[PDB]
Design a protein around this motif. Structure first.
Motif, PDB file in Angstrom:
ATOM      1  N   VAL A 352      31.778 -44.527  58.354  1.00 32.20           N
ATOM      2  CA  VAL A 352      31.447 -45.623  59.107  1.00 32.20           C
ATOM      3  C   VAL A 352      32.678 -45.756  60.140  1.00 32.20           C
ATOM      4  O   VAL A 352      33.656 -45.982  59.908  1.00 32.20           O
ATOM      5  CB  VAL A 352      30.917 -46.926  58.417  1.00 32.20           C
ATOM      6  CG1 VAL A 352      30.593 -47.840  59.177  1.00 32.20           C
ATOM      7  CG2 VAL A 352      30.147 -46.723  57.047  1.00 32.20           C
ATOM      8  N   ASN A 353      32.238 -45.719  61.406  1.00 30.60           N
ATOM      9  CA  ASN A 353      32.987 -46.190  62.501  1.00 30.60           C
ATOM     10  C   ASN A 353      32.454 -47.828  62.769  1.00 30.60           C
ATOM     11  O   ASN A 353      31.609 -47.792  63.324  1.00 30.60           O
ATOM     12  CB  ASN A 353      32.791 -45.444  63.642  1.00 30.60           C
ATOM     13  CG  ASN A 353      34.178 -45.691  64.659  1.00 30.60           C
ATOM     14  OD1 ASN A 353      34.847 -46.940  64.525  1.00 30.60           O
ATOM     15  ND2 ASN A 353      34.367 -44.802  65.650  1.00 30.60           N
ATOM     16  N   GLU A 354      33.375 -48.916  62.582  1.00 30.87           N
ATOM     17  CA  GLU A 354      32.704 -50.030  62.620  1.00 30.87           C
ATOM     18  C   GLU A 354      32.434 -50.122  64.113  1.00 30.87           C
ATOM     19  O   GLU A 354      31.511 -50.891  64.476  1.00 30.87           O
ATOM     20  CB  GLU A 354      33.894 -51.113  62.127  1.00 30.87           C
ATOM     21  CG  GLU A 354      34.130 -51.225  60.641  1.00 30.87           C
ATOM     22  CD  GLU A 354      33.021 -51.438  59.739  1.00 30.87           C
ATOM     23  OE1 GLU A 354      31.933 -52.146  60.452  1.00 30.87           O
ATOM     24  OE2 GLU A 354      32.876 -51.157  58.473  1.00 30.87           O
ATOM     25  N   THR A 355      33.171 -49.796  65.092  1.00 31.87           N
ATOM     26  CA  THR A 355      33.002 -50.051  66.630  1.00 31.87           C
ATOM     27  C   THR A 355      32.726 -48.545  67.022  1.00 31.87           C
ATOM     28  O   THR A 355      33.752 -47.812  67.051  1.00 31.87           O
ATOM     29  CB  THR A 355      34.182 -50.850  67.126  1.00 31.87           C
ATOM     30  OG1 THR A 355      35.296 -49.878  67.444  1.00 31.87           O
ATOM     31  CG2 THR A 355      34.670 -51.796  65.986  1.00 31.87           C
ATOM     32  N   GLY A 356      31.526 -48.506  67.765  1.00 32.55           N
ATOM     33  CA  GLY A 356      31.544 -47.096  68.401  1.00 32.55           C
ATOM     34  C   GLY A 356      30.894 -46.113  67.674  1.00 32.55           C
ATOM     35  O   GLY A 356      30.627 -46.144  66.389  1.00 32.55           O
ATOM     36  N   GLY A 489      40.888 -45.511  62.217  1.00 36.34           N
ATOM     37  CA  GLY A 489      39.449 -46.409  62.567  1.00 36.34           C
ATOM     38  C   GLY A 489      38.158 -46.062  61.911  1.00 36.34           C
ATOM     39  O   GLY A 489      37.416 -47.189  61.518  1.00 36.34           O
ATOM     40  N   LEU A 490      38.408 -45.004  61.073  1.00 41.55           N
ATOM     41  CA  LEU A 490      37.285 -44.564  60.100  1.00 41.55           C
ATOM     42  C   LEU A 490      37.169 -45.300  58.808  1.00 41.55           C
ATOM     43  O   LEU A 490      38.288 -46.113  58.772  1.00 41.55           O
ATOM     44  CB  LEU A 490      37.114 -43.017  60.014  1.00 41.55           C
ATOM     45  CG  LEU A 490      35.893 -42.412  60.564  1.00 41.55           C
ATOM     46  CD1 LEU A 490      36.020 -42.463  62.144  1.00 41.55           C
ATOM     47  CD2 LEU A 490      36.191 -40.770  60.351  1.00 41.55           C
ATOM     48  N   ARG A 491      36.152 -45.304  58.110  1.00 43.06           N
ATOM     49  CA  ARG A 491      36.074 -46.038  56.866  1.00 43.06           C
ATOM     50  C   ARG A 491      35.368 -44.963  55.989  1.00 43.06           C
ATOM     51  O   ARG A 491      34.489 -44.403  56.412  1.00 43.06           O
ATOM     52  CB  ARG A 491      35.864 -47.378  56.950  1.00 43.06           C
ATOM     53  CG  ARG A 491      35.576 -48.063  55.606  1.00 43.06           C
ATOM     54  CD  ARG A 491      35.265 -49.550  56.171  1.00 43.06           C
ATOM     55  NE  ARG A 491      34.256 -50.077  56.583  1.00 43.06           N
ATOM     56  CZ  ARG A 491      33.002 -50.112  56.019  1.00 43.06           C
ATOM     57  NH1 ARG A 491      33.032 -50.005  54.899  1.00 43.06           N
ATOM     58  NH2 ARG A 491      31.748 -50.571  56.686  1.00 43.06           N
TER      59      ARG A 491
HETATM   60  C1  LIG Z   1      35.357 -45.254  66.862  1.00 43.55           C
HETATM   61  O1  LIG Z   1      34.912 -45.891  67.904  1.00 43.55           O
HETATM   62  C2  LIG Z   1      35.708 -46.178  68.655  1.00 43.55           C
HETATM   63  C3  LIG Z   1      35.049 -46.883  69.870  1.00 43.55           C
HETATM   64  O2  LIG Z   1      34.244 -45.970  70.616  1.00 43.55           O
HETATM   65  C4  LIG Z   1      36.549 -45.162  69.331  1.00 43.55           C
HETATM   66  O3  LIG Z   1      37.517 -45.504  70.140  1.00 43.55           O
HETATM   67  C5  LIG Z   1      37.568 -44.728  71.518  1.00 43.55           C
HETATM   68  O4  LIG Z   1      37.845 -43.473  71.240  1.00 43.55           O
HETATM   69  C6  LIG Z   1      37.759 -42.836  72.702  1.00 43.55           C
HETATM   70  C7  LIG Z   1      37.840 -41.452  72.577  1.00 43.55           C
HETATM   71  O5  LIG Z   1      36.903 -40.923  71.281  1.00 43.55           O
HETATM   72  C8  LIG Z   1      38.729 -43.531  73.806  1.00 43.55           C
HETATM   73  O6  LIG Z   1      38.722 -42.836  74.835  1.00 43.55           O
HETATM   74  C9  LIG Z   1      38.564 -44.872  73.452  1.00 43.55           C
HETATM   75  O7  LIG Z   1      39.699 -45.361  74.397  1.00 43.55           O
HETATM   76  C10 LIG Z   1      38.619 -45.643  72.309  1.00 43.55           C
HETATM   77  N1  LIG Z   1      38.598 -46.897  72.654  1.00 43.55           N
HETATM   78  C11 LIG Z   1      37.233 -47.666  72.659  1.00 43.55           C
HETATM   79  C12 LIG Z   1      37.299 -49.096  72.875  1.00 43.55           C
HETATM   80  O8  LIG Z   1      36.552 -46.773  73.403  1.00 43.55           O
HETATM   81  C13 LIG Z   1      37.228 -44.236  68.150  1.00 43.55           C
HETATM   82  O9  LIG Z   1      37.911 -43.276  68.599  1.00 43.55           O
HETATM   83  C14 LIG Z   1      36.114 -43.713  67.100  1.00 43.55           C
HETATM   84  N2  LIG Z   1      36.545 -43.170  65.983  1.00 43.55           N
HETATM   85  C15 LIG Z   1      37.273 -41.961  66.170  1.00 43.55           C
HETATM   86  C16 LIG Z   1      37.779 -41.583  64.514  1.00 43.55           C
HETATM   87  O10 LIG Z   1      37.411 -41.414  67.072  1.00 43.55           O
END
Ligand SMILES: *[C@@H]1O[C@H](CO)[C@@H](O[C@@H]2O[C@H](CO)[C@@H](O)[C@H](O)[C@H]2NC(C)=O)[C@H](O)[C@H]1NC(C)=O
Ligand SMILES: C[C@@H]1CC[C@@]2(OC1)O[C@H]1C[C@H]3[C@@H]4CC=C5C[C@@H](OCCC(CO[C@H]6O[C@H](CO)[C@@H](O[C@H]7O[C@H](CO)[C@@H](O)[C@H](O)[C@H]7O)[C@H](O)[C@H]6O)CO[C@H]6O[C@H](CO)[C@@H](O[C@H]7O[C@H](CO)[C@@H](O)[C@H](O)[C@H]7O)[C@H](O)[C@H]6O)CC[C@]5(C)[C@H]4CC[C@]3(C)[C@H]1[C@@H]2C
Ligand SMILES: CC(C)CCC[C@@H](C)[C@H]1CC[C@H]2[C@@H]3CC=C4C[C@@H](OC(=O)CCC(=O)O)CC[C@]4(C)[C@H]3CC[C@]12C
Ligand SMILES: CC(C)CCC[C@@H](C)[C@H]1CC[C@H]2[C@@H]3CC=C4C[C@@H](OC(=O)CCC(=O)O)CC[C@]4(C)[C@H]3CC[C@]12C
Ligand SMILES: CC(C)[C@@H](C)/C=C/[C@@H](C)[C@H]1CC[C@H]2C3=CC=C4C[C@@H](O)CC[C@]4(C)[C@H]3CC[C@]12C
Ligand SMILES: *[C@@H]1O[C@H](CO)[C@@H](O[C@@H]2O[C@H](CO)[C@@H](O)[C@H](O)[C@H]2NC(C)=O)[C@H](O)[C@H]1NC(C)=O
Ligand SMILES: *[C@@H]1O[C@H](CO)[C@@H](O[C@@H]2O[C@H](CO)[C@@H](O)[C@H](O)[C@H]2NC(C)=O)[C@H](O)[C@H]1NC(C)=O
Ligand SMILES: *[C@@H]1O[C@H](CO)[C@@H](O[C@@H]2O[C@H](CO)[C@@H](O)[C@H](O)[C@H]2NC(C)=O)[C@H](O)[C@H]1NC(C)=O
Length: 1101
Positions: A352-356, A489-491
């Motif tokens: 799970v990626n809580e955000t995105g 970020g992951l879970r």
């Molecule tokens: C989980 O989701 C977040 C949110 O989208 C990811 O964070 C972003 O990652 C991208 C590249 O994949 C960056 O360009 C952004 O700056 C990051 N932050 C945001 C707020 O978008 C995160 O990478 C994801 N998990 C993993 C393991 O990649």
């Protein structure tokens, strides 16, 4: 007759299809030939046997016959559609009055310099077209997994455009060589041309009946919409009934504003006295021989403590402490397990990626290296891996992993084309098959169907090995995943099959138990000090040690019979028994102090025995009211809480015996040796003055009860899973994910037993794809109960697959060596074998299907089919869904599924559907089975049950009270107060958020037992009073409070206060939510009723 079309004058172009030769509307074709008449009756139908001057020739009919065969297989499922289809193209080409409804828009020249038609115009009633489209609207093609309209109608959703496709001129793609235009409106005032109107057949027609699958109309509309389950109006139905009851009650009050016992008493009096002599004799025997009974008690406890230490000390597991082994859902589970094997053990992992989004090349690359490790080279201590326990659909097949990695077959895709490839595989799973060769639904793999935007993907592993070896491997997987280093970020949240049992038997809240014990020893010593301030620590010690001897005795006496107590509920008995056990210590000791204050002629031996004989009926009624309340709570069938009532019932009995016999002796020795010298109100006057307002208190408390009788129907049902597991565990995160990121439901099975399946009568009760079968069949009913019920996903009918497998169209499926019944070998790709059933031997109305012994002859080659040549083989899908012995199919299973089930309310609702549906087939022995059903079998009858248990307890309290108090009027008041506490706590249960389980139902049944201890002492003192005291009601009630009121506040009341408070702080939330809020609300609610309300009510009895 008048024909606008006749004969063929030649092709429009080289190799092009011959076009008919236009003729004037006055053209009169000659009489038909013998051959034409034979063709028309055969190719078109017998209704044409009367036509004489037709507008078609031999070439036209043979060409028409050849063309019609093109679309016959597509629309052969529903004879009504086929009949209508032929009629439209038969009259259009051979009707005698062809020119009446046919016009030639344009005519072109042919190769032979003969005019030919290129465009045509026809007119028909819109009613005919609307019916025609309806007949063929819902035809389903077997192989396309979609409506046949796509192949024939091009997805047309309107009758107007359906005919347009048929009239489209697409000779290259096999379409009509010449354009055809249809007009749905014609204001034929001239009436020169007659509109095309003819008979129309719908699927409902008896002659041309069609299956439910073919059209909606033929499906069972006998769906009586069940009503009354939910509430009515903006308030619950019961609440509205109560509200009107108050309104009519007010009107009666408004009218008010305007305006033999002696025989029983004698027998009861003799019985009551006899108890007094019996009890005083026991005290004399114990006090006269203090050492004799003290050595026995010490010796006996050591004997019993020996049994628990070594002979028997056991715990349980979830299926043994939450399901009764006599219920009907457990007799069904055993039957399913024996024949069709236990359900697969399921391990689930959420990423799970809580955000995105989750899917990215970094995460995807990382996971591929930790899913090729779990399933290939984990190698638990015994050197057994997933490859030795995993579920293999066949004897030789890569075992099932329900992960998105299977789309690439465990091959890390390229850095560039991974995004597009994943989307294509998800959108069309048929084009992306896993190693075990079955499409993977995108809902079982991702949180949402968008894939690229999914917040989490799910990995499921299936274990078909149930021995203890499979348990050993799951220990390794649990350890492996806990310490896995996921990227930032992951879970991860997982639940192996054994995770629940491990975590339930992991909470160890024995520390807090020792703190509640310490506090109560402190408080007991303080409250047991003499009026002079001197403290008697030894008496306090005996109070704590005496209660222990009861718990150990019960845990040793009871374990002999084989009862096992759960760890979770073995940590609750100490609080319950100690709160109730220590109550009688203060009453005996404190009342003994009073006897010393006045009339000191008696000595210690004579004083104590007098103390015992005086309140013995008060003590005896407490014991008898603390075993009926517990015994009635033993009618709950959940083994976890049934053993809690039996364990406490014995503990209370032993505690009482070890108190009026062992503690009396200890008290005598301590006091005799000490030989204390003979002894020589703020907050009370304010409280006493309050009781002067009899009517103010009654009105306030009465209003509280009535306003709490319209909130009972607001109490929820069910026990939340997250509560049971201790906090900080890895299962709190998992259960949160299953409720938000899982888009599939449990696979409910529909077992059918003792059905012949060899006589045509029985097969028609499960038919779902054929016409002549019953409409209320199992397949038809389950098809309709998908838009209103919880069982949504499609049913897997093995009986309809079996009959389709014999279809002569699928020649490869049922190949048999010619001249013999032997099966064609798979290595015989030659004309050495033919189909089992000839072209004319198989029909959609069950005209030549296998019957009798033949049914089991072919069932032995379908269920052994390779499934590689054609998808209709049955060896892989339905190998374990049959229990047959080459003479019958005695059992069988049909698989379905529920929808996500994202709450505790959906679990109870889903279970009701399974029971409701399984009772909709009186002619079958059907019973539905899903893995979770056994765990929700209590809520079906928890409504009526809780009324009976509580209603029975209140009745029992009234009966015993009358026997002892010897006053019906006093007993009725006590019963009225107790029922007022239960209702008040019930309404507060809704507000506090406590649900109604078998765990919180026993807590509510022992509330009457604890709620009688507060009030029984006040009531009895009111009934029995000294002669010198006045007989007026106010004097007696005031006398009672001044006598036994202090002991209630310092004893029954405050002692329970200390015990419950400590229980609040615990790891498991099941003790904090159920055993604290319920037992802390009771004390506050019972304290108010016992002190502020009851004396006011008694004064105006
Ligand atoms: C989980 O989701 C977040 C949110 O989208 C990811 O964070 C972003 O990652 C991208 C590249 O994949 C960056 O360009 C952004 O700056 C990051 N932050 C945001 C707020 O978008 C995160 O990478 C994801 N998990 C993993 C393991 O990649
Ligand atoms: C919590 C959990 C979650 C839920 C869960 O537990 C609880 O639930 C549990 C329930 C479990 C499943 C249950 C039982 C099976 C059966 C078995 O299956 C045999 C495999 C065969 C399946 O056959 C048919 O399977 C379906 C019928 O069964 C059919 O679909 C329909 O069936 C009915 C329509 O009539 C209707 O029901 C619906 O319309 C529709 O359903 C489907 O179309 C058809 O494939 C594979 O067949 C192939 O055979 C050949 C290869 O061998 C191929 O030939 C080729 O050869 C080369 C390949 O090498 C090529 O490249 C060439 O190009 C090409 O020519 C050929 O093409 C191909 O067919 C595979 C395992 C599986 C899926 C289980 C997995 C795990 C669970 C999902 C669990 C799971 C964990
Ligand atoms: C007295 C205290 C210790 C509570 C005792 C009962 C609990 C252990 C029960 C109450 C509700 C139960 C849950 C209700 C629903 C489900 C779904 C169901 O999941 C399945 O897939 C079925 C598994 C199987 O068939 O064994 C069974 C596990 C679980 C979490 C149950 C596990 C056991 C729970 C937590
Ligand atoms: C003298 C006693 C019976 C009065 C005090 C009873 C209380 C224990 C109250 C508190 C909440 C009440 C429940 C709240 C909701 C409902 C509605 C309804 O619940 C159902 O599930 C109905 C259908 C079914 O039984 O499956 C039936 C009564 C019931 C269980 C109530 C029964 C009585 C309860 C348990
Ligand atoms: C199987 C799919 C591709 C669908 C779309 C095709 C169906 C074919 C077999 C059907 C659909 C409509 C039929 C059709 C339309 C109209 C005419 C004109 C007529 O006076 C002779 C029959 C003829 C020429 C037939 C031939 C067969 C057709 C073209
Ligand atoms: C579950 O797996 C275990 C381990 O593979 C199976 O037990 C093995 O069986 C083989 C064949 O008889 C023996 O050679 C091994 O020594 C066994 N191992 C152990 C640890 O006992 C077991 O049979 C499987 N269960 C089922 C139902 O298939
Ligand atoms: C429907 O079932 C009948 C049952 O035999 C099939 O055969 C028909 O049987 C009747 C019996 O009176 C005969 O009159 C018909 O001539 C038979 N049909 C033939 C020979 O094609 C019939 O084939 C099935 N299919 C239908 C009615 O469409
Ligand atoms: C094959 O299985 C069938 C099951 O249908 C057996 O026949 C039934 O057996 C049960 C149990 O003895 C009886 O109660 C039924 O009356 C039998 N007849 C039915 C259900 O129609 C059959 O005996 C089995 N054959 C063998 C050789 O064991």
């Amino acid at each position: 007759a008048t024909c606008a079309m006749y004969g063929n004058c030649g092709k429009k172009s080289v190799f092009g299809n011959e076009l008919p030769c236009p003729v004037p509307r006055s053209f009169e074709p000659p009489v038909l030939s013998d051959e034409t008449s034979k063709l028309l009756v055969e190719v078109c139908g017998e209704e044409w046997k009367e036509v004489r001057y037709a507008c078609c020739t031999k070439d036209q009919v043979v060409a028409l016959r050849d063309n019609l065969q093109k679309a016959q297989p597509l629309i052969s499922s529903c004879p009504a559609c086929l009949k209508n289809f032929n009629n439209l193209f038969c009259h259009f080409t051979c009707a005698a009055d062809q020119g009446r409804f046919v016009n030639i828009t344009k005519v072109e020249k042919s190769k032979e310099d003969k005019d030919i038609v290129a465009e045509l115009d026809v007119f028909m009633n819109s009613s005919w077209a609307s019916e025609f489209y309806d007949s063929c609207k819902n035809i389903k093609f077997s192989a396309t997994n979609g409506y046949a309209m796509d192949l024939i109608g091009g997805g047309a959703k309107n009758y107007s455009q359906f005919l347009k496709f048929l009239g489209d001129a697409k000779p290259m793609l096999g379409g009509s060589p010449f354009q055809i235009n249809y007009k749905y409106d014609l204001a034929n005032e001239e009436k020169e041309w007659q509109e095309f109107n003819d008979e129309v057949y719908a699927c409902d027609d008896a002659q041309y009946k069609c299956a439910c699958s073919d059209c909606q109309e033929s499906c069972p509309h006998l769906k009586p919409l069940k009503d009354g389950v939910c509430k009515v109006g903006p308030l619950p139905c019961f609440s509205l009934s109560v509200l009107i009851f108050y309104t009519i009650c007010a009107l009666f009050a408004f009218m008010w504003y305007y305006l033999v016992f002696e025989s029983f008493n004698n027998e009861t009096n003799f019985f009551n006295g006899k108890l007094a002599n019996l009890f005083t004799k026991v005290g004399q025997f114990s006090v006269e021989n203090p050492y004799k009974i003290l050595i026995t008690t010490v010796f006996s406890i050591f004997v019993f403590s020996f049994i628990i230490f070594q002979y028997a000390t056991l715990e349980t597991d979830p299926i043994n402490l939450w399901v009764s082994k006599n219920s009907e859902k457990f007799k069904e589970k055993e039957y399913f397990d024996d024949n069709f094997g236990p359900f697969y053990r399921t391990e689930q992992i959420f990423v799970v990626n809580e955000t995105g989004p989750v899917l990215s090349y970094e995460t995807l690359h990382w996971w591929f290296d930790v899913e090729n490790f779990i399933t290939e080279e984990l190698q638990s201590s015994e050197n057994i891996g997933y490859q030795d326990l995993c579920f293999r659909p066949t004897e030789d097949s890569t075992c099932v992993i329900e992960s998105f990695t299977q789309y690439f077959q465990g091959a890390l895709p390229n850095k560039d084309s991974w995004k597009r490839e994943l989307q294509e595989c998800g959108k069309f799973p048929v084009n992306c098959l896993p190693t075990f060769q079955q499409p993977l639904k995108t809902n079982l793999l991702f949180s949402d169907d968008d894939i690229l935007n999914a917040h989490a993907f799910v990995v499921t592993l299936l274990l078909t090995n149930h021995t203890q070896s499979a348990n050993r491997w799951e220990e390794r997987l649990e350890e492996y995943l806990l310490d896995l280093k996921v990227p930032e970020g992951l879970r991860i949240s997982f639940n192996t099959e054994i995770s629940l049992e491990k975590e339930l038997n992991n909470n160890n809240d024995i520390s807090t138990v020792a703190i509640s014990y310490l506090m109560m020893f402190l408080y007991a010593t303080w409250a047991l000090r003499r009026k002079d301030g001197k403290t008697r620590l030894l008496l306090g010690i005996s109070g704590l040690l005496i209660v222990l001897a009861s718990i150990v005795c019960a845990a040793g006496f009871l374990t002999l019979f084989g009862l096992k107590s759960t760890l979770i509920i073995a940590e609750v008995i100490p609080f319950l028994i100690l709160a109730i056990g220590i109550d009688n210590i203060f009453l005996i000791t404190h009342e003994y102090d009073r006897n010393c204050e006045q009339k000191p002629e008696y000595s210690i031996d004579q004083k104590i025995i007098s103390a015992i004989g005086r309140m013995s009926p008060s003590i005896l009624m407490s014991l008898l009211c603390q075993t009926g309340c517990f015994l009635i709570a033993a009618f709950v069938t959940m083994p976890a809480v049934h053993n809690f009532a039996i364990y406490s019932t014995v503990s209370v009995i032993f505690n009482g015996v070890l108190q009026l016999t062992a503690y009396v002796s200890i008290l005598s020795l301590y006091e005799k040796r000490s030989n204390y010298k003979q002894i020589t109100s703020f907050l009370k006057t304010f409280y006493f003055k309050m009781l002067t307002q009899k009517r103010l208190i009654i009105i306030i408390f009465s209003a509280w009860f009535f306003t709490s009788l319209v909130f009972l129907p607001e109490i929820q049902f069910g026990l939340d899973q997250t509560l049971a597991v201790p906090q900080d565990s890895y299962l709190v995160d998992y259960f949160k994910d299953v409720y938000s990121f899982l888009n599939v439901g449990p696979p409910v099975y529909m077992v059918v037993k003792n059905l012949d399946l060899t006589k045509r009568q029985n097969q028609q009760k499960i038919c779902g794809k054929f016409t002549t079968c019953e409409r209320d069949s199992l397949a038809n009913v389950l098809e309709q109960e998908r838009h209103r019920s919880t069982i949504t996903e499609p049913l897997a009918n093995w009986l309809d697959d079996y009959f389709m497998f014999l279809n002569p169209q699928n020649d490869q499926c049922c190949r048999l060596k010619k001249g013999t019944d032997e099966v064609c070998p798979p290595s015989f790709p030659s004309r050495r074998c033919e189909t089992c059933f000839q072209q004319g031997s198989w029909n959609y109305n069950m005209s030549g299907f296998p019957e009798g012994k033949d049914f089991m002859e072919y069932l032995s080659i379908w269920i052994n089919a390779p499934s590689d040549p054609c998808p209709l083989g049955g060896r892989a899908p339905y190998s374990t869904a049959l229990v047959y012995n080459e003479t019958s199919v005695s059992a069988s299973v049909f698989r379905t599924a529920h929808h996500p089930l994202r709450s505790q309310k959906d679990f109870i609702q889903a279970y009701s559907d399974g029971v409701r549906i399984s009772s909709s087939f009186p002619e079958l022995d059907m019973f539905a089975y899903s893995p979770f059903y056994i765990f929700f079998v209590q809520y079906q009858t928890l409504g009526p049950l809780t009324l009976k248990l509580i209603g029975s307890a209140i009745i029992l309290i009234f009966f015993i009270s009358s026997v002892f108090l010897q006053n019906i009027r006093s007993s009725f008041l006590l019963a009225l107060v107790v029922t007022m506490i239960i209702v008040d706590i019930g309404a507060l249960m809704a507000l506090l958020g406590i649900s109604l389980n078998a765990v919180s139902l026993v807590n509510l049944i022992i509330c009457v037992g604890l709620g009688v201890e507060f009030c029984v002492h006040i009531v009895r003192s009111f009934t029995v009073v000294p002669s010198e005291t006045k007989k007026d009601a106010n004097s007696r009630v005031l006398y009672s409070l001044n006598t036994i009121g202090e002991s209630v506040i310092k004893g029954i009341t405050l002692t329970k206060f200390i015990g419950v408070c400590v229980l609040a702080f615990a790891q498991s939330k099941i003790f904090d939510v159920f055993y604290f809020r319920m037992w802390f609300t009771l004390i506050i609610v019972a304290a108010l009723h016992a002190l502020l309300f009851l004396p006011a009510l008694l004064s105006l009895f």
